[PDB]
Design an enzyme around this catalytic site. Sequence first.
Site, PDB file in Angstrom:
ATOM      1  N   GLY A   1      32.857  39.176  35.788  1.00 30.50           N
ATOM      2  CA  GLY A   1      31.772  38.641  36.588  1.00 30.50           C
ATOM      3  C   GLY A   1      31.848  39.124  38.022  1.00 30.50           C
ATOM      4  O   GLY A   1      32.434  40.168  38.314  1.00 30.50           O
TER       5      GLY A   1
ATOM      6  N   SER B   1      37.624  42.588  33.034  1.00 29.94           N
ATOM      7  CA  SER B   1      37.995  42.974  34.395  1.00 29.94           C
ATOM      8  C   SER B   1      38.367  41.812  35.309  1.00 29.94           C
ATOM      9  O   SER B   1      39.473  41.775  35.858  1.00 29.94           O
ATOM     10  CB  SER B   1      36.834  43.753  35.013  1.00 29.94           C
ATOM     11  OG  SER B   1      35.608  43.064  34.824  1.00 29.94           O
TER      12      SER B   1
END
Lengths: 192, 192, 192, 338, 130
Positions: free
Chosen positions: C67, C96
């Site tokens: 996000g 990530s």
Amino acid sequence: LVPMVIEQTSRGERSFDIYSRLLKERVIFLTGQVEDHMANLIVAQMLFLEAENPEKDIYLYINSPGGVITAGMSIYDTMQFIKPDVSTICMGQAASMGAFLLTAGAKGKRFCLPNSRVMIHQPLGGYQGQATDIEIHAREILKVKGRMNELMALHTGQSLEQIERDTERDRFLSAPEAVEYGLVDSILTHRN
Amino acid sequence: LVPMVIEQTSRGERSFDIYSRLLKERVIFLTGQVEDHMANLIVAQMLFLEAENPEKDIYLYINSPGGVITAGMSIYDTMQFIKPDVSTICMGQAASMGAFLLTAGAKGKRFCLPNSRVMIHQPLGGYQGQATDIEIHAREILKVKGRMNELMALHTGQSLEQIERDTERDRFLSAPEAVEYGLVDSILTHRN
Amino acid sequence: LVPMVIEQTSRGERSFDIYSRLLKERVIFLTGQVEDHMANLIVAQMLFLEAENPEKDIYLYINSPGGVITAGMSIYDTMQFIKPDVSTICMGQAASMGAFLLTAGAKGKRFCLPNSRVMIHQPLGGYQGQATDIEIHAREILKVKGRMNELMALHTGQSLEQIERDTERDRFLSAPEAVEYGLVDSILTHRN
Amino acid sequence: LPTPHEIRNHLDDYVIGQEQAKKVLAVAVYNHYKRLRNGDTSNGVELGKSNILLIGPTGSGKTLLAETLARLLDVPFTMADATTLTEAGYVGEDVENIIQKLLQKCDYDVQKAQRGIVYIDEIDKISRGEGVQQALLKLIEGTVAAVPPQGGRKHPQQEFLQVDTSKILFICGGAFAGLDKVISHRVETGSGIGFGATVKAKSDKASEGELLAQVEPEDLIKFGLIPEFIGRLPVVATLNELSEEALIQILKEPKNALTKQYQALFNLEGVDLEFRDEALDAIAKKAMARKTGARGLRSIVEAALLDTMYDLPSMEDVEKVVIDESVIDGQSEPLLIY
Amino acid sequence: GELLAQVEPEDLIKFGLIPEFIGRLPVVATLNELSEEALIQILKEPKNALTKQYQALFNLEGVDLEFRDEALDAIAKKAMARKTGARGLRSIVEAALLDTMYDLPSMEDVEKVVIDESVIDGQSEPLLIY
Ligand SMILES: Nc1ncnc2c1ncn2[C@@H]1O[C@H](COP(=O)(O)OP(=O)(O)O)[C@@H](O)[C@H]1O
């Protein structure tokens, strides 16, 4: 907005929603398009009432235009599994799945209102893709069609061949016609 | 809306939601498209029951068409991690992800209703971008495919070669066929 | 509809939602895409738990496809700022941003389930406007990239050069691979 | 006034596996008797009573520890239950009724009654009635209670015997099942649901022994006890558990052991009795699953010996009788020697 | 039945019994509700059985009373439902024989009266022999 009702009990006054109050009296409402979420809710109510009193009879009020078959089988299998006899009453209408659940009720406890309208048709589905995949899904829906017809013949009492002919296309049966076909047993005209 | 129910206890009458009431009896409902949000809710329910009584079994009711693999895999690892056995019952249908969780249940405790349909297929996904990126994502989904087939073979008992061939395309299995394949153990036709 | 659970103690019985019941046990759930609102909620839980007890460890269950970077840094800085050691457990996956928070957990208290998937990549961003403004924003994202790589190298223990080459493109990792890479410390398979 | 070590030796004869608890009661009871023994009170200082609080599981020996001490040092012993006095209506008459029961054993002697040891149990139940605790603390702190003189048809207020409860030793036993979780939360990690939490509810409860030993006033207030009541119970003795092996020892090791009682009954009849070690584990295992501790041991043995006790007097030529694990199960019959 | 066998001291204390009193009574003999077979024996086997009592009563009037083997089973079934133990038997007999006893003295030519299972149900009337 759902109204709230008061129930007098030994402990004292208690407040219930109109649907929960009827659930206390072993009444389950099957309304609208059949789907996974509403079906699981009905399944939870059947299991809950079974534990409370497995001897008393449960009631199911069916007013629905039909829906998903898989969701309906969850309700049908639950009804046959539990010991309590499930009484099905048709209010307004009972389409393909609603009718299958209506006739699936306990023999002798299936009822229909006088102005009700019952309709039974074969399963409808569709698939887009490769020819190989089409053959797979096409065979699966045909199996469901045969399975549904075999169960309806058992509950209704009609021959399997007759069911295939009648369910080939949409067939509408009134309350008296349903009694003759075997979908329901009697009509509830007035309180006696 | 969900109908409230009353539970009698030593303290007095208590009000519970239909789903929460069943959760008190170690019953978890897996319904709809598998996603991260609902999966974390199921995971929380499992961990909570483990603390209350790690010896007593947990019953997972599966009626879903499948979904994300990562979300479903968080439920599988939770089931294997916790000490209590997780019984899996299939209501209506159990697709690719629902079937993996169904067969992942404790040996001898996996059940299926007579009219339930169990479908298994290989993972499907897609990516758009550069060729270098496509190679990365293509290798990943293929690795996931082997991982799922390896686990499915372990639970079902079939060889990895057979699982790979059968799951190359959509394969629909009825409740009795699933017993022979190894996805489930017994069929709950009627309460005994 | 989240279920309600009853906690029974000598003082009395209390009803909590499933998420709030686990919060009492210092368990915070990170689910879905990272954003300012969800991240702010996680931050409030960390501060609340720190006040109750600044010595007991805090657990963070991560299942998220990454996000916003700025929202993630609030969670990361908060974890390091508070005295309690924040444990991180990866359920399902950790992309990530989730992976950055996962490896950011206290040394020796970072775990992952066996079938979890961990993916790490460089930041993604875009800007439309004048050339002068582009240089400003382009320099900013590159500074963020170097900063994230430095922090990941510190927690993972890998060299900065190795982290730059690996994070240039998406790099999917498995639970065993993450252990050797340094993102996690151990794998939780069974409670024993 | 025997030393605490001597008192512990007497308790070891009938109670086993609770050596730590015996030490606490031995020193506590020794101080109480020393104060009574030191009636001169030459020093200006006024000695204060010390009340013990027993925290242990059911059938762990809390009740047995009370009367056993009285057997060594002759004193009247009475027992009460908190559930009986939770009525909260005219509590004053029942609290004084307890000493009246104690007075019966001591020949209604006020001086002897003061030296008596009183015992209570199941204090966890009242913790949450709060009002019941208000009346109970007064009895422990010390109160003068009037009692009728050895019953009688009726007597005037003048004849009523008043006994001070300040000189009486009160033991408020209890079984705090949920308190162990409170201590783990305070001392150990505060996680019970998550992956990293400890949910090893194997029923072993071995950790509970040392966990309950760390009892402090903070965990008690969480349980619902008011701080004032806790203050009147400075001494605390904790029983860990009765293990399966410990139950086997209790069957024979005590002086008036259960096996010895039945053996003696058969000896006078004219036939001896032999208890094989195999039979002991079967009896101990049944008690552990039943959760009766040592209490169920008597019932399990009586049922096994009920059939033979009925036919053995009528029957003859039984030179000796033997028991095995199969007999405990009920499938087999006690072996008879001819 | 099968519930009282698991009686413990804690339940007796709740009833109101003193704990010290319970401890002083280690032996516990718990009885069980009489079965259909047991009630049938009491109807005829004892010397002072209920059937013999009415037989002597009828004999004092000049008539003999006979009870069929099947009737005893029905009486035992009705008595078990009453839950009053042995006393329940008298209730069933008095009800079934209420009508005949009221009219038997006034009636004439009655030398023997017989009762069967159908009479116990109440659908049939006591058989009279002339
Ligand atoms: N270590 C022990 N040795 C002998 N008997 C014991 C022991 N522990 C418990 N008992 C038995 O348990 C009985 C008391 O049970 P109870 O008062 O209900 O609980 P508690 O044992 O906690 O006081 C006594 O009659 C005693 O014979």
